[PDB]
Amino acid sequence: MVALSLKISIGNVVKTMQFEPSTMVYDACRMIRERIPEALAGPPNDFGLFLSDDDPKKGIWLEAGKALDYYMLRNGDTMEYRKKQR
Amino acid sequence: MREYKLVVLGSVGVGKSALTVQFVQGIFVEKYDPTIEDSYRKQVEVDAQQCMLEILDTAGTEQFTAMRDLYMKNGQGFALVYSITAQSTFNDLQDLREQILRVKDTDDVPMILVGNKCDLEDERVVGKEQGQNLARQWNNCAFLESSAKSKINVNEIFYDLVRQINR
């Protein structure tokens, strides 16, 4: 109840994922893998996030131990399930 | 192209997005995707009519309410779903509807009743019987029995309001 409510997108999909405004990006990345089978399609080591701006070149790749509220996110932003890979 | 924006309504505990995963991703799990307002994108074709991909799934969150209230206003399509084993929800969607009718101003709005999870009919508390006795009460809100697990009437649902949005 009450928390961020961003659009953790996963290619066409748009499963809103509620996070604690101060959730660890390292956790917000561990809270999704527990959901949607297409999400746990690997380890957290090959799965990070990406705040796809309005032009993914503008978008970014957040951290982990950070805190969502770091971007002072609000609710229904635009987070994407991205490969941590390299 | 047609553009269908549906409001998947559901009580807390049912499975709103659960139906929007066997649908857009093709996967059903025991962990019911969250409750915040989630939409699902899927390009479809109705009767050979290419329809645009946007649907909305609102659910028991007062955070997204304002936003969840805006889709009632437009309410291009409503998919109210309860658990066939959950009366407590079947019985709640009854007011939540009045919230639609309240903004639409009528019940003549694209809409469908759904008793999904028929795979728990083994428990069946509210079936297409009460469901349709309810749909009837809703004015025969056209009901369907689905199973986001056995993927039953999971596609017909959106297929039933598009036929209505085609006013």
Side-chain angles (χ1 to χ4, degrees):
Chain A
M1 203 203 187
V2 193
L4 273 162
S5 173
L6 332 97
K7 311 280 175 162
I8 283 55
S9 171
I10 323 209
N12 162 274
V13 203
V14 195
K15 298 307 203 201
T16 335
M17 211 310 185
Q18 235 153 359
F19 295 142
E20 283 168 7
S22 206
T23 329
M24 329 198 94
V25 169
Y26 130 61
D27 282 16
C29 262
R30 296 285 201 85
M31 293 193 99
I32 304 170
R33 67 180 194 152
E34 335 196 349
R35 285 162 58 253
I36 299 301
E38 262 163 28
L40 29 149
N45 190 39
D46 208 52
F47 157 40
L49 280 158
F50 196 89
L51 255 176
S52 149
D53 186 67
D54 191 311
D55 258 303
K57 312 104 69 105
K58 295 195 196 163
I60 31 164
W61 26 294
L62 303 158
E63 308 197 43
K66 273 295 326 188
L68 312 186
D69 175 61
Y70 172 57
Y71 256 47
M72 325 208 181
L73 297 154
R74 36 268 307 160
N75 266 295
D77 192 353
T78 302
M79 299 172 86
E80 218 203 74
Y81 187 103
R82 210 89 189 72
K83 253 65 215 200
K84 243 300 121 76
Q85 189 155 73
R86 286 186 166 201
Chain B
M1 248 58 64
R2 162 68 239 178
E3 303 200 323
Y4 78 154
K5 326 290 150 55
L6 345 180
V7 197
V8 140
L9 220 305
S11 311
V12 204
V14 297
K16 352 81 195 69
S17 278
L19 281 87
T20 73
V21 280
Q22 1 288 20
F23 193 74
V24 75
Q25 311 196 264
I27 19 184
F28 81 84
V29 278
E30 12 65 23
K31 65 203 70 144
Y32 4 94
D33 153 285
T35 28
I36 12 170
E37 200 191 71
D38 308 27
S39 151
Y40 55 104
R41 288 279 198 80
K42 184 69 249 291
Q43 188 173 322
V44 303
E45 183 171 273
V46 169
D47 207 330
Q49 302 166 6
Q50 281 76 271
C51 335
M52 289 283 229
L53 349 75
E54 288 63 38
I55 306 90
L56 195 70
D57 326 330
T58 162
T61 41
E62 89 83 61
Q63 298 302 106
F64 240 87
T65 14
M67 304 296 213
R68 118 72 116 80
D69 289 11
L70 180 68
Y71 261 69
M72 322 176 72
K73 157 55 76 60
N74 288 87
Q76 265 185 57
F78 255 86
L80 293 100
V81 325
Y82 46 74
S83 126
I84 47 128
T85 307
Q87 68 194 163
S88 167
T89 66
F90 157 78
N91 261 125
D92 194 48
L93 311 199
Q94 287 168 353
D95 195 357
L96 288 165
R97 163 171 158 106
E98 306 174 340
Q99 305 184 331
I100 313 177
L101 278 51
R102 159 171 143 65
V103 74
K104 313 263 69 271
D105 195 82
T106 163
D107 35 54
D108 177 80
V109 176
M111 193 102 81
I112 183 92
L113 191 68
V114 184
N116 180 244
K117 317 200 177 287
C118 189
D119 185 60
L120 319 182
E121 54 84 43
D122 175 276
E123 322 197 58
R124 206 280 236 81
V125 161
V126 51
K128 66 212 309 321
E129 175 185 12
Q130 326 198 335
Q132 76 94 70
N133 194 117
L134 177 58
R136 162 161 152 282
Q137 155 84 91
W138 288 21
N139 199 286
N140 165 20
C141 180
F143 161 98
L144 281 187
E145 170 167 282
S146 40
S147 208
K149 172 167 182 315
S150 254
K151 294 112 74 87
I152 312 295
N153 285 133
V154 103
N155 278 262
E156 285 59 277
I157 25 163
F158 85 81
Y159 210 92
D160 209 296
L161 343 181
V162 58
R163 284 190 74 194
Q164 218 298 91
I165 268 281
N166 295 180
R167 310 281 255 90

